[PDB]
């Protein structure tokens, strides 16, 4: 089997991407944030504290003939950006882009933090990191990908995120028309439960490439690119007037600037992030100070190749016995 679904930016800045997911019988379609940095599939639901729902589409298990309470199971998760959610668990039929998993753990939110409430466009998350991070207790549950894997034509999914435009998540096959040149594959460590890999270096604009190992995670659920302070300083030094602002929470730059591109290494290959991808617009409505899309990972504890980086590439998440990551230009 295979599946193929379109993923769509939630706003004009590409702050996140939502992908329609069918849950239950008859289908209930919810728009989920596919997140290769976590491993829980959770949804706004009929059980979510009413004051914490503001415009989201909810899953109602009582209306699904294939829903079953997973007796005794609970979940609770905290994300890198400080947001959180928790609740109980059902198993149900879940389909993504024509690919169907029966008995998928669907984690029903009883509580969500304010950032989730405030984002009316995201109905939940679908985790695509390794199942060792799944938070269901006392019996850890498998991700959608892990459940589908054996049925897939090939044990892979791909992320093809658009810049200010729709893109595609495919399961079970590699669309050879979706990228240019070749796919360069690189080793993955699963030791922390992430799609963790080592970039071979970087360049700023038309600058020379600096060969240096940068360990980080491929995370579709993170908006920006978070790299070591040295790298980030070298980037923003090429933008007149750019500075790190403690009050705003990172690098800002004059909205009148033309941003340089940023290149990152994948083995001997190179992925170029156009400067426009790094513009996240005014810090506040009407401001002439703009927020940067490349930020320091210092104090995160890990480097994150988020959407800013991933949307410049066609990315293969290879879930073979020894997992790997592939990057192609497009």
Curated annotation (Swiss-Prot):
Annotated Peptidase A1 domain ranges read: 17-328
Q: What is this protein called?
A: Endothiapepsin
Disulphide bond pairs: 255-290
Family statement drawn from the similarity comment of this UniProt entry: Belongs to the peptidase A1 family.
Q: Name one GO molecular function term.
A: aspartic-type endopeptidase activity
Give the record's GO biological process terms.
proteolysis
Q: What class of enzyme is it?
A: hydrolase
Gene encoding the protein: EAPA
The question of whether Hydrolase is a record keyword is answered with: yes
Organism field: Cryphonectria parasitica (Chestnut blight fungus)
Q: Which UniProt keywords apply?
A: Aspartyl protease, Disulfide bond, Hydrolase, Protease, Signal, Zymogen
Q: Which residues form the active site?
A: 35, 199
């Amino acid at each position: 089997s295979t599946g193929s679904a379109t993923t769509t930016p939630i706003d004009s800045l590409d702050d996140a991407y939502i992908t329609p997911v069918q849950i239950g019988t008859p289908a209930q379609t919810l728009n989920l944030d596919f997140d290769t940095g976590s491993s829980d599939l959770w949804v706004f639901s009929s059980e979510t504290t009413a004051s914490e729902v503001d415009g989201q589409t909810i899953y109602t298990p009582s209306k699904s003939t294939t829903a079953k309470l997973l007796s005794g199971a609970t979940w609770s998760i905290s994300y890198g950006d400080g947001s959180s959610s928790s609740g109980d668990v059902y198993t149900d039929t879940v389909s993504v882009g024509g690919l169907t998993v029966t008995g998928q753990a669907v984690e029903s939110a009883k509580k969500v933090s304010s950032s989730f409430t405030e984002d009316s466009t995201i109905d939940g998350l679908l985790g695509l990191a390794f199942s060792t991070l799944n938070t269901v207790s006392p019996t850890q549950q498998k991700t959608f990908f892990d459940n589908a894997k054996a049925s897939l034509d090939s044990p892979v999914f791909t992320a093809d995120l658009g810049y200010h435009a729709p893109g595609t998540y495919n399961f079970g096959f590699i669309d050879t028309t979706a990228y240019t040149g070749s796919i360069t594959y690189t080793a993955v460590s699963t030791k922390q439960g992430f799609w963790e890999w080592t970039s071979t270096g970087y360049a700023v604009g038309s600058g020379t490439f600096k060969s240096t190992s940068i360990d980080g995670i491929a995370d579709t659920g993170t908006t920006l690119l978070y790299l070591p302070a040295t790298v980030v300083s070298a980037y923003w030094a090429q933008v007149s007037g750019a500075k790190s602002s403690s009050s705003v929470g990172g690098y800002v730059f004059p909205c009148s600037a033309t941003l340089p591109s940023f290149t990152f290494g994948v083995g001997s290959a190179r992925i170029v992030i156009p400067g426009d991808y790094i513009d996240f617009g005014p810090i506040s409505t009407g401001s002439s100070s703009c927020f940067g899309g490349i930020q320091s990972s210092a104090g995160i504890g890990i480097n994150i190749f988020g959407d800013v980086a991933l949307k410049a590439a066609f990315v293969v998440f290879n879930g073979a016995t020894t997992p790997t990551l592939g990057f192609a230009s497009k």
